[PDB]
Symmetry: D2
Subunit: 299 residues, 4 copies
């Protein structure tokens, strides 16, 4: 059923990509026992974009410890856009609200262990490797294009610098931030990432505690609350499963233990066309429909 059903909903939702800003749609669901299913363009490589924020938040937590990270960044939804800047001036002293939005993610990248973008990125990549099992390939072309026009982000970054919420130089931090966003991946890779988090940091395939439980838990908490930005409320209400998105069109979702996926799973969706919030338009229609039918809500 699952397999058959995904093939149906993918083909049923593919068309709404004319309402976003493209007609590609892929999904991959993975279980702790290795069972894997997919439909659509699930093996097509795309940059993780904002999905990498979950990982860097993890890395920073593992290196510095949750306390150290919480001093620098909060965990509250902002109600604003992922790249909004107003709360950095308004809300004094100006601490970023959470690590999912651009501002907090920029802060996180700045507190990653290392003295240079390379040193920090090395630590991030190594962790990434403990998850997907290989080193992250990067999309130089995308990183280049992005490094040349990351205006909004440099503004955010520079503003954070001033209010002293950047444990590193601006351009240095941009590089870290822009590279992680350029880390290539497929629905298969992010699906496996969710499956690991779904099981509180335990890799069910490799039987090894790759991420500390409390950290993986904290990560999930933030996905639910800020993972989909100022659309998270909707996701919680109509999907009710931790999820994170990437402007490139990806969505990493996951279901914690306890008919279908009774043992939980990691979800990986790809849908280039994105909505006003920056979340995959059809990717979201596919995730909502799934959760709806199989009743995945953790509420």
């Amino acid at each position: 059923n699952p397999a058959l059903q995904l093939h149906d909903w993918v083909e049923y939702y593919r068309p709404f990509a004319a309402n976003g800003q493209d007609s590609q749609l892929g999904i991959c669901v993975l279980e702790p026992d290795g069972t894997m299913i997919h439909a659509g363009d699930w093996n097509v490589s795309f940059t993780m974009q904002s999905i990498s924020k979950v990982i860097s938040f993890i890395a920073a937590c593992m290196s510095r410890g949750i306390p150290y990270v919480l001093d620098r960044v909060d965990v509250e939804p902002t109600g604003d856009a992922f790249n909004s800047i107003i709360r950095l001036e308004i809300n004094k002293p100006g601490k970023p609200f959470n690590p999912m939005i651009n501002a907090g993610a920029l802060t996180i990248a700045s507190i990653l262990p290392g003295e240079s973008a390379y040193e920090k990125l090395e630590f991030l990549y190594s962790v990434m490797e403990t998850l997907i099992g290989k080193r992250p390939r990067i999309h130089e072309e995308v990183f280049r294009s992005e490094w040349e026009t990351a205006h909004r982000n440099r503004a955010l970054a520079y503003y954070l610098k001033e209010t002293n919420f950047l444990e590193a130089e601006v351009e240095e931090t941009l590089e870290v931030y822009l590279k992680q966003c350029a880390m290539e991946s497929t629905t298969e890779d992010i699906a496996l990432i969710g499956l690991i988090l779904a099981h509180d940091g335990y890799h069910p395939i490799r039987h090894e505690q790759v991420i500390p439980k409390d950290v993986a838990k904290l990560a999930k908490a933030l996905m639910l609350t800020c993972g989909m930005y100022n659309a998270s409320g909707k996701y919680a209400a109509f999907v009710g499963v931790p999820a994170k998105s990437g402007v490139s069109g990806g969505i990493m979702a996951l279901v914690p233990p306890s008919q279908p996926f009774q043992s939980g799973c990691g979800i990986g969706i790809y849908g280039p066309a994105i909505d006003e919030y920056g979340n995959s338009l059809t990717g979201g229609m596919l995730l909502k429909h799934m959760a709806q039918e199989w009743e995945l809500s953790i509420f």
Copy 2:
């Protein structure tokens, strides 16, 4: 153990009420089988205040239907104070972000079924009655006091009226709104309301579907995302249990099925509240439970 650990914990966190604006602290946990445990001021009656926004919301949905409510109110966190008015003007057209914040709940009040505040209130008291099993008692004194000085809320109400997000007269809506907030309850009552919700609307004591499953589910979603206002994030991250509070000191919380392996309802009372409007001691108490028994749904 739970019964005992609760007594220890309450006695332990009671003294922290000195940091908020109060020395009381009470709890009550209820299970589907009927087992109930409590410690401290669990029987001291208190107004539900905002804890009622969840029932009025649930009621609007039962009457109007979810589709109708979602056209009048959204379900997004504002990242602002519960009584913040900012977004009613800045975010045009001006649809209130969610029913948990004062702006949304007022909108919700205006859409309840009825030609008057009385009619809208009776429908509310009835739903609230198929939950706690009795007509709710209203703290007349508290209401009269709030009625005279609910300025902030009146501004909110009036602004919503201006942006056409009130399907009722302002004063009529204030009435309905300030009335539910005044409804009286003890940890036992909200604990029950929380158990019913935890079980997707099935009342585990009368064995009956008292709330449309999808509606109860939606309420729980809102609780987790906005129930504790601009403090909800920390709550999902440090307690991880859907919760809802009232400035009177109440906290309603619940654990979905799978200690308390079959879910549960939580009722907490702690008059002293923090900067976000959530009970200080009550909040600490819920956190300890959450940590120690691992209730987090994450």
Copy 3:
């Protein structure tokens, strides 16, 4: 010339009333020597609306003294709409920015001498009488309509109450505020009002110091800076003369002493159709054109 010229520009600008939200346009310029000119619909009665704010600000200043008024209300432009409310919550303790916007004007009305709307309004009317020479007639119909739908204003009012910036009950204050806005008048009446202010509180016709110099000066200062709300910057730049507007379409302008109007004057314009800022669309095109040609700018 002046007379002839006004008749021309009125007829040239009348048509642009199809771009506002009506085709009426009137003007009346008055000098200290009694010389008066007008064109268009200058003798048509309209409610002063926000123009009354200048008067109540005056009254309050005369009764309480500028210090007392300045404690309750500031004199800074807000950059927001005349009926905006955000700064009442954002900017703590939440003091209104100026007496020209709705919020500050509501505060002013609340500090007018009296215990009731009647007692306060009596004081305001009496002052109004010392200016126009008669008691203000009121447009009951407009006041009624307005009292039934002044939502935005009650919100403002009620919010001020909470932050304690209203020296009176909300509804009481609304009545005061809503009545002054309903005070009827013609271009002739407001023109004479400007002429008095133009001469620092001296009635040039009646030869009597009706308004204290420092108060009339303060009033002018605020017209220039906040009189046209978030359009005052434009007026200062393209008109450069103190001015106040009323949503009903009126504009009261004035030129202080030192070819045309060398001895100064008071200007009264009426143009029902108003722009996005709430300022008469054609009334403004007429005031700009005048200032431009005769070079009225005080800069």
Copy 4:
């Protein structure tokens, strides 16, 4: 008397520099006939900082023309801090409100004529030269220091670039911007610049039209409405003279024709500045003059 009253006043307000973040205070008033009076630290050189936004603005207008500048920047007060970024995001599309605030002046810098910061700077130094009568000297040390830590301003610049309100590269614009701010001057120089402006651009010492009348008029309008940022209101109400300040302590002001019956230029220096970025002592000094001699154009 003026020469003397100035000495008394300066000596009198000097001591108030303890309340701001400095003990210096200097002034210089210049008339069309060439009479010049001064008291205190009037010859102590200081960077113009924001006082230069008026000349760069005047220059952009001379080169591009007013119509072109007004499509890139408005002339409205923001009611916010000079270095506030808020409106660049909230007020869409995001056109900076006015050239006096940091956001606008940066926009202005980007539109000056030129293919590089050097070319845009030379055009600026030339205009500034047909005013003070000499190539402006740049405080290299101060500039180098600001260049390394102008974060806030960099954020502003970068946001404008994002909303397409910069007709130049960010760093190139920062350069031009941080360079003019570093231009050196004494009360005498800004006083002169103020006299020229007071006379609608006619230089009363060389008898020549050095600034298009309409342009000089527009500059004076902006000075009165935004020159003192979110403190301009108080200034129109308590000084009533078009003024412009710099965080270095400078204040430029001027009185249009009809003491000083033929207008005048004012140059003030007072390092200690208030919460709005305007000189504390300098501000008090200008106010006293304004009151005592009745300079108010209102």
